[PDB]
């Protein structure tokens, strides 16, 4: 193990952090714009096309 | 004997005052720890 004993630690030493928990990779904002465009194009499909 | 006993009791009073001083110092350290925990909780809540 490390050194001879357990490493010293602060009496609180919380440090929550954990902003991201796995996942990451694909961004959410780009696909959010994608989903907005999806509902927009569905609304367009509701509007008449051709004829 | 009463004079000796009351002098001993007065020294006991002063050592109680010293003990209360150390207890207040421990309480101040605990309050500093509480403030650090509070700012950490505030940062975590901000992320939340």
Curated annotation (Swiss-Prot), chain A:
The subcellular location is:
Nucleus; Cytoplasm
Reading the lineage from the top rank, the first entry is Eukaryota
- Known partners and oligomeric status: Component of the Smc5-Smc6 complex which consists of KRE29, MMS21, NSE1, NSE3, NSE4, NSE5, SMC5 and SMC6. Interacts with NSE5.
Tell me the function of this protein. Acts in a DNA repair pathway for removal of UV-induced DNA damage that is distinct from classical nucleotide excision repair and in repair of ionizing radiation damage. Functions in homologous recombination repair of DNA double strand breaks and in recovery of stalled replication forks.
Q: What is this protein called?
A: DNA repair protein KRE29
Q: Organism, per UniProt?
A: Saccharomyces cerevisiae (strain ATCC 204508 / S288c)
Gene name of the encoded protein: KRE29
Swiss-Prot record, chain B:
The cellular location(s) given in this protein's UniProt record come to: Nucleus; Chromosome
* Top-rank lineage group of the source organism: Eukaryota
Q: Record's domain comment? A: The flexible hinge domain, which separates the large intramolecular coiled coil regions, allows the heterotypic interaction with the corresponding domain of SMC5, forming a V-shaped heterodimer.
**What family does the entry list?**
Belongs to the SMC family. SMC6 subfamily.
Q: Any other noteworthy remark? A: Present with 339 molecules/cell in log phase SD medium.
Q: How does it assemble?
A: Component of the Smc5-Smc6 complex which consists of KRE29, MMS21, NSE1, NSE3, NSE4, NSE5, SMC5 and SMC6.
Q: What does this protein do?
A: Acts in a DNA repair pathway for removal of UV-induced DNA damage that is distinct from classical nucleotide excision repair and in repair of ionizing radiation damage. Functions in homologous recombination repair of DNA double strand breaks and in recovery of stalled replication forks. Probably plays a role in structure.
Q: What is the name of the protein in this document?
A: Structural maintenance of chromosomes protein 6
Q: Which organism is it from?
A: Saccharomyces cerevisiae (strain ATCC 204508 / S288c)
This chain is encoded by the gene named SMC6
